[PDB]
Amino acid sequence: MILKRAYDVTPQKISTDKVRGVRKRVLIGLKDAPNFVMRLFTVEPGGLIDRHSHPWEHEIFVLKGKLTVLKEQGEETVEEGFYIFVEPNEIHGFRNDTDSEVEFLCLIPKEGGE
Amino acid sequence: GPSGMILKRAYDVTPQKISTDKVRGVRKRVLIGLKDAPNFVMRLFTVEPGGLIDRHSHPWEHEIFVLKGKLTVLKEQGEETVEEGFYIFVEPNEIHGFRNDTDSEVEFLCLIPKEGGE
Ligand SMILES: [Fe+3]
Ligand SMILES: [Fe+3]
Structure with a gap:
């Protein structure tokens, strides 16, 4: 059993033609x-x-x-x-039009990778 | 399957009492269910x-x-x-x-493969 603070997972910055100003944490991955x-x-x-x-x-x-x-x-x-x-x-x-950080949990089936 | 997206306040689902041999003092909201x-x-x-x-x-x-x-x-x-x-x-x-040793409600999201029901 794994019990961990989500914040402590290192976020990955994403910055591409379609994604900007986003960080992703993989909490429960393919492993x-x-x-x-x-x-x-x-x-x-x-x-x-x-x-x-x-x-x-x-x-x-x-x-x-x-x-x-x-x-x-x-x-x-x-x-x-x-x-x-x-x-x-x-x-x-998704977009964040506010002046502070927005956070959301997102779960996908494994075929979607992590 | 169907198209679209559902967007809903989780609290607009009524918390239902769970009462089994092994569970007491627990309620559950099904957010994204079997249906x-x-x-x-x-x-x-x-x-x-x-x-x-x-x-x-x-x-x-x-x-x-x-x-x-x-x-x-x-x-x-x-x-x-x-x-x-x-x-x-x-x-x-x-x-x-799980147990709640505090005076206030504890809430957690729990996701399982749908073969285990809802
Ligand atoms: Fe997507
Ligand atoms: Fe269980």
Whole structure:
């Protein structure tokens, strides 16, 4: 059994053509997980995960702040305490329009890698 | 399967009492359940003050994230208390349980493969 403070997992900075101002922690990865993986994303102020889709679902829980969720069309802001279920293949992305860090848990099936 | 995305305040799900031989003082909200999940389910557990999930095991893993309070985790050998912001991975067949030794509600997310139900 593994019991650990998520913050103590070293975050990975992501900065690409589609993702900016985002850090990813892999809490429960491929090494441990038989079926699905647990990540914690931190979105800096003005950070963005542009619209994309995958063959797998997402299960998300918003831990901190106000998260702007990009949808196939339009967007929706949610707060800490919301969960999000993204169906396979659904276009989605995220933005932080606030002045403080936003955090959310994101779990995917293992085929999605970590 | 279906398309779209569900976005919902977890507290708009009513916390239902769990009452079994091995559980007392616990409520559960099914967030992403069997009716919708392709692979694994998401539940939010509330352990009332003095609540207890006795040591047990099952043939699937747990992935847990502590949302509120101080959760006492029971292990095959001894116990350990963790707090909001901790994650827990329980291997398949690993003995585990939980207790709330504090005066206030403890909350944690718990995800299992959907073959274990919701
Ligand atoms: Fe995605
Ligand atoms: Fe269990």
